Scaffold this active site. Sequence first.
Site, mmCIF file in Angstrom:
data_model
loop_
_atom_site.group_PDB
_atom_site.id
_atom_site.type_symbol
_atom_site.label_atom_id
_atom_site.label_comp_id
_atom_site.label_asym_id
_atom_site.label_seq_id
_atom_site.Cartn_x
_atom_site.Cartn_y
_atom_site.Cartn_z
ATOM 1 N N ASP A 196 9.427 -4.437 -8.977
ATOM 2 C CA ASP A 196 8.346 -4.076 -8.066
ATOM 3 C C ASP A 196 8.389 -5.177 -7.007
ATOM 4 O OD1 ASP A 196 6.038 -3.537 -6.676
ATOM 5 O OD2 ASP A 196 4.755 -3.360 -8.466
ATOM 6 N N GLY A 254 5.862 -6.843 -0.467
ATOM 7 C CA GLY A 254 5.751 -5.955 0.683
ATOM 8 C C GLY A 254 6.853 -6.183 1.697
ATOM 9 N N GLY A 264 2.958 2.329 -2.428
ATOM 10 C CA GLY A 264 3.053 2.955 -3.738
ATOM 11 C C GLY A 264 4.116 2.412 -4.674
ATOM 12 N N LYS A 265 4.500 1.149 -4.498
ATOM 13 C CA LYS A 265 5.512 0.546 -5.360
ATOM 14 C C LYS A 265 5.017 0.376 -6.799
ATOM 15 C CE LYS A 265 5.865 -3.018 -2.806
ATOM 16 N NZ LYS A 265 4.910 -2.561 -1.763
ATOM 17 N N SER A 266 3.869 -0.281 -6.969
ATOM 18 C CA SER A 266 3.294 -0.501 -8.305
ATOM 19 C C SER A 266 2.860 0.814 -8.952
ATOM 20 C CB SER A 266 2.080 -1.447 -8.227
ATOM 21 O OG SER A 266 2.443 -2.694 -7.659
ATOM 22 N N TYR A 267 2.272 1.699 -8.155
ATOM 23 C CA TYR A 267 1.840 2.995 -8.665
ATOM 24 C C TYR A 267 3.045 3.738 -9.240
ATOM 25 C CZ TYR A 267 0.113 7.792 -8.847
ATOM 26 O OH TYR A 267 -0.240 9.057 -9.261
ATOM 27 N N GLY A 276 0.789 -1.219 0.000
ATOM 28 C CA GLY A 276 0.000 0.000 0.000
ATOM 29 C C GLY A 276 0.831 1.284 0.000
HETATM 30 N N1 LIG Z 1 1.818 9.042 -4.953
HETATM 31 C C1 LIG Z 1 0.543 8.688 -5.026
HETATM 32 N N2 LIG Z 1 -0.471 9.557 -5.327
HETATM 33 C C2 LIG Z 1 -1.785 9.204 -5.408
HETATM 34 N N3 LIG Z 1 -2.165 7.927 -5.187
HETATM 35 C C3 LIG Z 1 -1.196 6.990 -4.876
HETATM 36 C C4 LIG Z 1 0.119 7.394 -4.804
HETATM 37 N N4 LIG Z 1 0.934 6.450 -4.513
HETATM 38 C C5 LIG Z 1 0.132 5.394 -4.388
HETATM 39 N N5 LIG Z 1 -1.157 5.695 -4.603
HETATM 40 C C6 LIG Z 1 -2.310 4.788 -4.558
HETATM 41 O O1 LIG Z 1 -1.857 3.811 -3.719
HETATM 42 C C7 LIG Z 1 -2.861 2.758 -3.619
HETATM 43 C C8 LIG Z 1 -2.052 1.457 -3.341
HETATM 44 O O2 LIG Z 1 -0.701 1.719 -3.899
HETATM 45 P P1 LIG Z 1 0.168 0.668 -4.741
HETATM 46 O O3 LIG Z 1 1.057 1.430 -5.636
HETATM 47 O O4 LIG Z 1 -0.659 -0.479 -5.221
HETATM 48 O O5 LIG Z 1 1.407 0.207 -3.856
HETATM 49 P P2 LIG Z 1 2.057 -1.157 -3.360
HETATM 50 O O6 LIG Z 1 2.324 -1.832 -4.674
HETATM 51 O O7 LIG Z 1 3.304 -0.654 -2.727
HETATM 52 O O8 LIG Z 1 1.126 -1.982 -2.561
HETATM 53 C C9 LIG Z 1 -3.427 2.689 -4.991
HETATM 54 O O9 LIG Z 1 -4.859 2.741 -5.084
HETATM 55 C C10 LIG Z 1 -2.521 3.775 -5.616
HETATM 56 O O10 LIG Z 1 -3.047 4.306 -6.799
HETATM 57 MG MG LIG Z 2 1.789 -3.562 -5.816
#
Ligand SMILES: Nc1ncnc2c1ncn2[C@@H]1O[C@H](COP(=O)(O)OP(=O)(O)O)[C@@H](O)[C@H]1O
Ligand SMILES: [Mg+2]
Length: 354
Positions: free
Chosen positions: A234, A237, A92-95, A90
């Site tokens: 990516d 966690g 923001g790795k994938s984002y 959660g």
């Molecule tokens: N910098 C950001 N700005 C706006 N939304 C973000 C941002 N970073 C992450 N999110 C939101 O984060 C939520 C979960 O993030 P995600 O990237 O899936 O990270 P992880 O892969 O690390 O679990 C998503 O619904 C994503 O779009």
């Molecule tokens: Mg992810």
Amino acid sequence: SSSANSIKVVARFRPQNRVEIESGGQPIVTFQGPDTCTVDSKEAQGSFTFDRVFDMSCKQSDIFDFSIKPTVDDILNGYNGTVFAYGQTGAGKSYTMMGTSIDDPDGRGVIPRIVEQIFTSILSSAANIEYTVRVSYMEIYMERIRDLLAPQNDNLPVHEEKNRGVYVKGLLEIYVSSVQEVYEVMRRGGNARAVAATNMNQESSRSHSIFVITITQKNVETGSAKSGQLFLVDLAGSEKVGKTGASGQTLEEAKKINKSLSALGMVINALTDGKSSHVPYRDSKLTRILQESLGGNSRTTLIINCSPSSYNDAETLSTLRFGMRAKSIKNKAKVNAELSPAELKQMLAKAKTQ
Ligand SMILES: Nc1ncnc2c1ncn2[C@@H]1O[C@H](COP(=O)(O)OP(=O)(O)O)[C@@H](O)[C@H]1O
Ligand SMILES: [Mg+2]
């Protein structure tokens, strides 16, 4: 720059999410310089300085233009490199790596932007330089490698030879001649990841995904040809497993703690310690595949994704410290690319007048 080949570490804080905000979460991070941040919370407290820190307002284009774009130039010049996205689920790795959707201009992340830049440079290059680009997309879960482009193969082996390094034997590599072809490859891989996550009793948060781009270039006038490859990772966690908090499967498979996301930490520790050249790359397939990225021949960038909420202060502190430890790692500075020389000599011989 033989020593300036240190691992670049950039921190990125995303805005608080719904669960944090609606759970009483408050901001605990302050920003000083463009490379410094400070945390002040119950289980945090501390001041950290990295090669760069992005606050909650920074957009996808900012991430790319201020710390990723230089990497594309390296691969286009015959250098190898790796970009890691590290942090708790959660964070923001994938984002950051792929983005909300690669089809949403503002929301698209690092990888699609890297591809656009690669083809833009290629297309504006002299006719004298002919390029070739090929991609691979894999996922590692429970130490099993699945080809996201050939999903049926979900247990690919890792091989290694002195004259080649580490590679996944049988991994599909697809030549791509345009930004559009690569984009579809990314869509296909994303689809494959959802299939595995949905039907294979697999935790999506505990698997690593690796996108590989390999660019070959030949100077048709000199007959000289070289290549560079970029690994876009990516990671799973980084939060504590504890085998007690998410309905643990068989205590055995709970070898989760031994997995690459642990092997990575041990590899980083060994390198920062420096008392032993026997870094534990074998503790996981991830660290074997990416061994050169950690202490070897590579331009490496580590992106640590953090939450700015007091709700997640403990994990954010763990992530920052980890980032701090990786910061002191120096990568091998040998083997450039094209002959010029790319340095001052680069002709390790001995003498041999004859
Ligand atoms: N910098 C950001 N700005 C706006 N939304 C973000 C941002 N970073 C992450 N999110 C939101 O984060 C939520 C979960 O993030 P995600 O990237 O899936 O990270 P992880 O892969 O690390 O679990 C998503 O619904 C994503 O779009
Ligand atoms: Mg992810």
